[model samples]
Target chain A: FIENGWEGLIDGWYGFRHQNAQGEGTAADYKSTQSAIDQITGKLNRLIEKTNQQFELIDNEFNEVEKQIGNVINWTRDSITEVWSYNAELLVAMENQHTIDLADSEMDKLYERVKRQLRENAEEDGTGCFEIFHKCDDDCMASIRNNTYDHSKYREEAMQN
Target chain B: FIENGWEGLIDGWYGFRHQNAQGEGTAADYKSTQSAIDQITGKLNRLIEKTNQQFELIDNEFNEVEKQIGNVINWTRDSITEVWSYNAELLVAMENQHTIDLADSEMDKLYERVKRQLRENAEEDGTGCFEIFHKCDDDCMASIRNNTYDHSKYREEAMQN
Candidate 1:
């Protein structure tokens, strides 16, 4: 009863079935699709070349940025270490002066003043310093808090004792 | 006159329609549906949690692989640099060597041999090594090549020099 039932439907259906048929038709006429093929192939090759060039550019940029960041870290580390060494020397000098003091009250006052100075100096410096010793101190404190020491602290304490 | 004309079609259509209207359509009637939804939600949540845990494991493994790859690259770079430095030193030694009675052919042979050795060593290190130089070299030869440098003339001059 339907005159152009399947054939008409094949060409008419603008849905999934139509797409399937269109793909098949393109495959069937591949030689005739040479112009389109060439266009696509040329575009693809250019795109690849452009992408490779861009990658090289980005990689070079990354190296420069990495070097710059490394220099910044080195500068920050040296600055922090210098401050830490200065503070430690000052503390040792004050402690020696305290030991030599005749008056116990005077020694106590000096101790309190040193403690206050230490606190103030620490506050002046940023909390997150890039010093190796600071990192080690943090790691030690974290291990003690978390109960996750990699090395036995008991041995270190005994050695110090 | 048309006995089974309109009534039959109407009856067929309205029969299912009437039953559908008469069926329980209250929110309370969706208890089974709600139970299914809850069950599905719980299963989906558990599946998501399991997937997240799997991803964490994969991330840790990937980090370990990245670290190992970094170490391998470091070793490769150091070894290549070591060989290249030795070759450079050898070239300097050859250049500085005082010849009493050397032929032009003998000097030519020495030049060619040194060039060949350097080129072979460089080529053996592969594109990856050169890529590192090309990536980080502020003054790159390849960039000069791309910009139309007379590399052959330069090479000949370098050999004589």
Candidate 2:
């Protein structure tokens, strides 16, 4: 009743099942294979285009982040510079330890730490804290690069260099 | 007859130099001001939309990074757990020592470092990483967001928010 159970099914089949049943050869086979290849190529091309679009999106996002970083840094720099002009004497006094009797508290330590962190986070080329920022960003870019055929250029270059 | 400049001008002028000194606001003036306001509002709406799109991209990128982290962690856990099922002798050796001696010195050291780094990377919730990555990807998205208003739902929500 179980006409063909897994193992026996292969053994039970015969004749055309094991032979070139379609009998369509040469030209037809070539055409079929070529069609399949063309389909794959077309799909691949579309995939590449879609990937490029996605990467472009990522690149746009990165630019926005960079702009934001610029805005923050500019804002910070402007505010600091403005206040620096106002507190020129205070800064000089602190630097020189000229006994303006500045209150030395944990707050000063905290302030120093935060300032250092801000500086570290601020933009620079090559060694910018923005580079660290880009680690995450570049990661996405890298992904788009890796998974996308559009990244072939990068891969090729990397291989070359 | 020598073109009496001041005298001829005075003779030609009326009793008052300028009778209609008071000026009324022209239609152009009102239109200009209204136009300026409209432009400002337009730009403001655009900024708000761009910001919202960025936020969405970041949130989505954050989720994506989380998924990648989860996957990496799963892989690492599986790899590490697999070691426990290694030959009893190898397990005993590993238990005795803090590390496993995989025989190949360079490979063993490299693998150890790689595993440790992976573990360290996997430990973080990847918020910071996502922020940085989102920053990059969002740069492009932000550009698109600023220029395009295709996604009506996103634009509307951005306005309401």
Candidate 3:
């Protein structure tokens, strides 16, 4: 069942399994494996894309809205510097030329906690909070789509570096 | 770089490399591989937990606010059936009691698109969209944390009818 493309990980394995039955795999085997990974990668790309699109729609919709109320809502998709809050009304003066004490006030505390989690979760150059703040985004798929991501790149970093 | 935990998939390979060096991989190798996957799984669980907590904070904060204006905002965290919208006002007569025409109105179109994508992604018992709408949430990690998931479950499904 390849619901979110993870199932393809299993499927791709089957396609490449026969190639690994005997000994050290061949180039063709690597290609098969590559294909498998790519297939799943494509699926994941679509999922990620849809997710980004979904968020964008939300943000865009919010952009069009006039919060007659000095309301605010924040999302996990932003850094403290770039909070995604909608403070309605020039009716009251506020930071960023908006009204309501909605999101900006909590920025410091939230970022502090996020940064702490980043350090605690760290065990690599990329796995921790960095992934949350950065990599788990459209960039990963961009690399894939641009053909900038491949086994060669992986092998280079892996085998050489 | 094992940011966001995907790197463990790569690292775990090294740990299990020797076990698969010659021919058919060993039972021990499976454990090593499992260890790798689980390590990444743990990282992902923490990430997911943090994400959930973040949303809860946002939602909780919103719950406290008295929207001086009968405003509304929607999030991707809900289904058409259970819309997570906030509509301020006994000030207005609207659906679902207190409210603005915020979330419920969009339910039909949003679900229609989500369902359409579900069908387009219908290449699996669970992959395509089931993962997006379902599996890619706290439930996956809950099962993991509950120790209800393991190679046994996977192997059973794979080996059985």
Candidate 4:
């Protein structure tokens, strides 16, 4: 009997009920109220689930952004280091070249002086062409023939500078 | 009539006229219970608005984070461009240095050969020192004095390589 009349009456009232109270139609008014409460509980659960899903997406994106930032930092650091090393090496090469230039200039002056001395010696001896040639094949020529410039020493000095 | 009852019932419910509907009472149980519906509706609306506000704040933060990500991308691209340009300039400088070294080496070899030739001529002459010295300071020295190695040409070659 309650199912017949009360249910129809409650259903009618439920139709006129708040939009949030759709599930609140039952045999007893308290049962209807309990049904409304259940409806709200279900709504809250859905809301919580939706909020959690949204936050989960946000958290994932945030983590990805953080990872990208870390990668950028690492790449920048490595690139800068490479540039610095290259600059250092170039500076050292330039310094070594300068040292080589100075050494070569000194060697040129010494070669000129040695050549002059040999010519004077030949004249003092009153030597002929062949004799002068013989004198030319001396220890002085041998001593000056070899290159004395030490590239490694210059490189080390350049690095120190 | 519907508005009349709704207003009276909602006002009655909002005013807590029934104090849990002690039924001062309702001629029917539905009337007393309708009060609860109105109360729940108001509460649900407020909760929904509050939840929407929370969602709006999250949305704003998400937008800001996305903008920051865009800025990071711009900054990284600019940094990479700067580094690339720097590295290219350094490479060019290194190549020029190598070209200069090769040119200097050739000049050294030529200078050494000329010195050796002068020494032999001095030996052959056996003339007075001044006469040999006069000959030594001639065309051969002039030929050696002129630098044959073109740095710019070598630079172009190195760049091509």
Candidate 5:
């Protein structure tokens, strides 16, 4: 027979299994694992705080820029108003001269009518209309002759008739 | 004669060698490792979901705030247009007044010329020009005299000559 039969080998295998039994992990190992978990939590909290501060900084800067834009808009409006006021002042200054020029133009038309009437009256009286109606001597008569006036021709025709 | 020296020591130290030697892992150990791995995966998945949700929340709120800013800009433009329309209306009203003021100024110059002519004719005929031309009372005439009526002085010189 074998020195140890199959039953003896089975008994020896059971004894080996009992000797090598390792129970639960030591407390130090569990503590080390817990410490690692705590470190992760602490790091996560710090990262969250840092991220929140970044957002706060962005918000503060955005508000400051918005306020500055508002100030710029207000200043632009004030500048536009100032420029408009100056434009109004310039318009007012020009108004008086514009009115005077209009009056002068109207007066010239009336003066022409007056001169034409004088010429007609002088022609009817058989006197030379040139002498009574001409202010600038021949120059004024020449200018009037060169213009659309057919008064002298009509008068000459009347004389012939 | 003996087994290997290390092997003999190992056998003596234990009782015998195990036939199938898969060291000392209990069912609890296997289950605990799987459970710890499962917990880590679960925590990581939860953290990932939480981070994704936070990002989504941030994105939604950012878009909302941006939309609000857009609305503010549109409202500002509308307000500016409203103010501009009022400004345009005021300018239109002022334009009518400006035209009336311009016409009045021209009429005043014409009236002054007419008054000077009437005064000259009255001096020539020794008639009263005051009744026909004087819309203002004696107080108004005295006020006009107190200011400048240099035209009358030149006319008086012409009359003397």
Candidate 6:
């Protein structure tokens, strides 16, 4: 009877062994396509997991830069940093503090500029998609996915309109 | 007669120690401004060194991500990966290979899209400066730098034109 628990029965049920071979070919097509999809999905899942880790590392690095900028602003401009002791050295020190105050403003402007760039890049178009591929564009779904040949033009046109 | 090396002589020469100090005030102004500039410059220099290290770390992280994506593409599609052994399992394996090939192309598209974003961000706007402050814009020199009040308008106007 059944050599395998499920596979042998399924193969015989689908006429894969009887040799008339009408349903056998159809069963093979379905099995092979399903199997291919499974393998590809597994590979893509691995890719996504790896990418997530990579992205986290990059995000952490960006945070480190932001922390430095924040420290400079907080240290130089946010807190009281001068003393008017009314002594010989007091006057020059006050004037020097003023210069540092200027530099603090410079650093603030730099901070704002960097933040703005990130915001703009993150913005999405009126469509439910980013204006650029790095953000929301998907060529993979439109082309080379479940199709025999390239159908990227179909997606390209869909996006164009 | 210099008493305590250069300090005493310079004090007398600039009238900082004498009783009827007419030139003392003017000398003080020069010294204060110079001292302020020096201190401010030092702070900015330190800020720059710290920023450079942070930026390098960010750059390296980005490189790591790119390397991972490159590995995915290279491993999946670059080499021949199928055999026609003409057995029961051969057909399904070939079809699975086809799916992997598709995934490789998808990975390549992602790589191209990410690299494009970096390149676009780095491009100069033909104004000999970055389009934004994070890259080339300088508000510090324009305002709060030299004169007492805010002269950012002066630089702002210069840039506007």
Best by TM-score: 4
Best-fitting candidate, measured by lDDT?
4
Model 6 achieves a DockQ score of 0.01
lDDT of 5 by residue, A31-127 (tens): 3234444554665565454333432232243455565345435544554565466456545544544444554444344334535744442321111
Write candidate 2's Cα lDDT for A40-118 as tens digits.
4665575454333432232243345575334434443454454445345334433333121122222233333323432
Interface RMSD, per-candidate values to 1 decimal: 38.7, 31.9, 22.7, 29.9, 36.5, 29.7
The parts of candidate 4 lying over 4 Å away from their true place are A1-66, A110-161, B1-65, B97-101, B104-108, B118-161
Could you tell me which residue pairs clash in candidate 6? none
lDDT of 6 by residue, A1-161 (tens): 02232354453222112112132221222443354445546655754544334322322434455653444333322222211122223334434454444444443343334334334333222211223223222333222122332324334543433
Candidate 1 lDDT over B15-106, as tens digits, reads 11111222421111133334444554665565454333432232243455565334434443454454455445544433333121122234
Q: Which stretches of candidate 5 lie over 4 Å from their true place?
A: A1-161, B1-65, B120-161
Backbone steric clashes in candidate 3, count: 10
Query: Taking the tens digit of each residue's C-alpha lDDT, what string does model 6 give over B1-161?
Result: 12232344442222112112122221222333344445446545633532111211211333454565446434432321221123226534643564455444443333333223223233344422223222222333222112232323333443333
Once fitted onto the true fold, the runs of candidate 6 whose alpha carbons sit more than 4 angstroms away are A1-161, B1-89, B113-119, B122-161
Q: Candidate 6, after superposition: displacement of residue A73 in Å?
A: 87
Better of 1 and 3 by DockQ: 3
Model 3 complex DockQ against the native:
0.05
Give the C-alpha miss distance for residue B22 in model 6, angstroms: 52
For model 3, residues B77-119, the per-residue Cα lDDT tens digits are 3321132133122212332231122223232223333333332
Superposed Cα deviation of residue B103, candidate 3 (Å): 40
- Order of candidate numbers by lDDT, starting with the best: 4, 5, 6, 1, 2, 3
Candidate 1: which docking quality band? incorrect
Root-mean-square deviation of each candidate, in angstroms? Answer: 46.9, 38.5, 24.1, 50.1, 58.3, 33.8
Candidate 6 accuracy as TM-score: 0.14
Question: Which CAPRI category fits model 6?
Answer: incorrect
TM-score of chain A of 6: 0.21
Q: Model 2 chain A — which ten-residue stretch has the worst lDDT?
A: A11-20
Candidate models: Cα lDDT each: 0.33, 0.31, 0.30, 0.39, 0.38, 0.33
